[PDB]
Design a protein around this ligand. Structure first.
Ligand SMILES: C[As](C)(=O)[O-]
Ligand SMILES: C[As](C)(=O)[O-]
Ligand SMILES: [Co+2]
Ligand SMILES: [Co+2]
Ligand SMILES: [Co+2]
Ligand SMILES: [Co+2]
Lengths: 330, 331
């Protein structure tokens, strides 16, 4: 594990730099952007907007983002490669399945799914040769039967390739606990795993208990807040009413309990969003005009001000991501 | 309408010839064929198999098929164009939504869906300029709230463009009655609509009533007979025990009641099938090795043998599809 695969090819571990580990260029659905690009204005408008945002994040110090859009989030790796080249920001692409698998995925065995993820990691996505650098999976509460198969196959693909696994959770339901049981049932090392959306909960005990076991804790929703828009139900349903400062203080809490090495921080931001209500992007961009730069422009200063040492901030934002993404065989 | 849109461009009504009105090159899911072509051996192997099949259907007299694969059936219009050109059979592509819409679709309003259907009809599918000549929709029992929006949008798209609508039904639940009610509420003329998989029912009067109202009746499951296959639960679950002869006899029943003009027949065949259990295709091909040629090779001769005249058979296989597919605006 001395090389990370990006959408422009392999980079060395030290080239990754300041890394956002849970982002998206566009959250959509399989086939959707190519079938109905006008939903986003145009594919050109979407790309131009992504490049603007990536250029601003780059200005703020971001060197790499991990796009955790799976097949069923409508990942378009050709778009990723395009905006990565235009903005000069490294993008790591994902394989895996999120919670909108179509029938041709849903009906598949753990063995078939394992071959699919391996294809995307080892040989390349679609016909592009672009290899995924991470595996994304998801539950929303107790795993469905198919979701158990997805997590087992993600564990098998990770063991075979060294590529890490990262999760969507409903944190309020402590999904991370079931996810960890399943992964461990496959012999996967907890240090290969990031339990994501974990700042959606204030149950610190749930969080430290997982970190104690060696899991990475993805605090990737820091800017997600509907405060000031509580009368917009779709936004509050999506974003929650907890403030960004509250979410960021979980980072400090984890640090204070000794778990700085287990923390990964991100915005879970995006430049198009079709798998929710129309015009939701306009709401989100008003909520967080900084977009992906929110972590380096607002969160890191806030923590430093609350007394987090520069050294600890560099560890969380540079070191942990490098360790996590470096392909690492058991 | 003087022209029907195909994956190779417009054709004249008379070029359509013998037409199968409900078929697939490949039944899959959006994005799936491009992300995981090895599920079908390879894209090349799938294309080759579809070409051989299309070539044998062409040999048996099939001039045109309507591939009723929607976005969420994983329609790959470039693949349709490639196999159309290689086999030299006309293929009409479809717009619409079947019963596996992803979130980005499921969350859309009737107005948005209407715009998406119109895009695929008037401007072209994806970035290809290939325009759909039909709109496929689906219910499986009482329409879900999303399926109502889909049916309304299909009706609005058909009214605006003249292109017909064709449906998947659970026939045993009389889906066609609610589908019709919805289409009529939008002022769509029944002669624009085919109520599909209708040979799945034994209720002749459910069928004759719709035909009387002016609906086309899609008898497109003729070869789907899971006969001698209860050893295989997903296959007999897929297919059924009713014989192909019994299903074909529904064509004769509609003819006998005076509805030959309202009948469309097809195989609902396919060369790949990822939206089901693995290796279902081997099972299907062993059951019906004629494939899309089953209609011209087995069904048409059987009907003639049962006394159905040549002109009537020409009417059903050539004249009805031509009338159906030819873009027709209301008054
Ligand atoms: C692809 As998402 C809306 O779970 O960040
Ligand atoms: C796409 As089908 C299985 O309803 O013919
Ligand atoms: Co998520
Ligand atoms: Co995300
Ligand atoms: Co059907
Ligand atoms: Co069909």
């Amino acid at each position: 594990g001395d090389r990370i695969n990006t959408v422009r090819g392999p980079i060395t571990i030290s080239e990754a730099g300041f890394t956002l580990t849970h982002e998206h260029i566009c959250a959509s659905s399989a086939g959707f952007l190519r079938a109905w690009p006008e939903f986003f204005g145009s594919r050109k408008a979407l790309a131009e907007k992504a490049v603007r945002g990536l250029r601003r994040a780059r200005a703020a110090g971001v060197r790499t983002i991990v796009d955790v859009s799976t097949f069923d989030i409508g990942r378009d790796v050709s778009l990723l490669a395009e905006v990565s080249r235009a903005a000069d920001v490294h993008i790591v692409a994902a394989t895996g399945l999120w919670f909108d698998p179509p029938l041709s995925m849903r009906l598949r065995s753990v063995e078939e799914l394992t071959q699919f993820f391996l294809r995307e990691i080892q040989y390349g996505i679609e016909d592009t040769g672009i290899r995924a650098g991470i595996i994304k999976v998801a539950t929303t509460g107790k795993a469905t039967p198919f979701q158990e198969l997805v997590l087992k196959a993600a564990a098998r693909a990770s063991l075979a390739t060294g590529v890490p696994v990262t999760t969507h959770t409903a944190a309020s339901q402590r999904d991370g606990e079931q996810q960890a049981a399943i992964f461990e049932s496959e012999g996967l090392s907890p240090s290969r795993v990031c339990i994501g959306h974990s700042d959606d909960t204030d149950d610190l005990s749930y969080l430290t208990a997982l970190a104690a076991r060696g899991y990475l804790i993805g605090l990737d929703h820091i800017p997600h807040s509907a405060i000031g828009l509580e009368d917009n139900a779709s936004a509050s349903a999506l974003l929650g009413i907890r403030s960004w400062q509250t979410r960021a203080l979980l980072i400090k809490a984890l640090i204070d309990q000794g778990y700085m090495k287990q923390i990964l921080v991100s915005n879970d931001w995006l430049f198009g969003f079709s798998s929710y209500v129309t015009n939701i992007m306009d709401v989100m961009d008003r909520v967080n005009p900084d977009g992906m730069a929110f972590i380096p422009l607002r969160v890191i200063p806030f923590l430093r001000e609350k007394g987090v040492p520069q050294e600890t901030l560099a560890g969380i934002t540079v070191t942990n991501p490098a360790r996590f993404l470096s392909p690492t065989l058991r």
